[PDB]
C-alpha cells in the first residue's frame, strides 16, 4: 500500500461555500456556472502503481483525469479550458496546479476526519467543497 490509499474510494459532495466566485475569477461563462453549481458530483480516486485517476461523475457530465505524481500532463476541464496540470504530494495534500492563458490555479485534496476536503484557490478567492464516503 501507499499514503495516497485515504484518498481511494468513491466520495459524494456534501457542501460546497464560495464555488461560484471562485468560478467567476477563474473566467468561467454565466450559463456554464449555472449548470455547474447545480451539480452534485461524485469524486472516484483510484491508484494502479503510481497512475493516479480522479474521475468527476454527474448526470451532467462526467470527466476523468489519469496522471503520475510530479508529472505534468494536459487536461481539459470541466468548463472546457484546456491547461497543463501537475499534481503532486505534499504532506499528505494533493496539489493540483492548472495553468492556461497565463493564469494558474491550485486545488488541494486533503483528508480530514471522514471527509475529504477540496479547496480551490483563484486570485484571493477561496471556494470548500466537502465530500464524504458515498
Ligand atoms: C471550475 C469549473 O468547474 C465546472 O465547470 C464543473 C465542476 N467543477 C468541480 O466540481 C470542481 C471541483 C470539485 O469539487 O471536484 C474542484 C474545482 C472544480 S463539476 C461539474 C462542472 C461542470 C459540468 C457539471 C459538473
Same mark, same amino acid.
Given at each position: ?38 451539480? +452534485?458530483?461524485?469524486?472516484? &480516486?483510484?491508484?494502479? %502503481?503510481? @497512475? ?8 451532467? !457530465?462526467? /470527466? ?17 479550458? +484546456?491547461?497543463?496540470?501537475? &499534481?503532486?504530494?505534499? %504532506?499528505? @495534500? ?8 497565463? !493564469?494558474? /490555479? ?29
Amino acid at each position: 500500500s501507499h499514503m495516497c490509499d485515504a484518498f481511494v474510494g468513491t466520495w459524494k459532495l456534501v457542501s460546497s461555500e464560495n464555488f461560484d466566485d471562485y468560478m467567476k475569477e477563474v473566467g468561467v461563462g454565466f450559463a456554464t456556472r449555472k449548470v455547474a453549481g447545480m451539480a +452534485k458530483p461524485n469524486m472516484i &480516486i483510484s491508484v494502479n %502503481g503510481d @497512475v493516479i485517476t480522479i474521475k468527476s461523475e454527474s448526470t451532467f !457530465k462526467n /470527466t476523468e483525469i489519469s496522471f503520475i505524481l510530479g508529472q505534468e500532463f494536459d487536461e481539459v476541464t470541466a468548463d472546457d479550458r +484546456k491547461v497543463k496540470s501537475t &499534481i503532486t504530494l505534499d %504532506g499528505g @495534500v494533493l496539489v493540483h496546479v492548472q495553468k492556461w492563458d497565463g !493564469k494558474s /490555479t491550485t486545488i488541494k485534496r486533503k483528508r480530514e476526519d471522514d471527509k475529504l476536503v477540496v479547496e480551490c484557490v483563484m486570485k484571493g478567492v477561496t471556494s470548500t467543497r466537502v465530500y464524504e464516503r458515498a
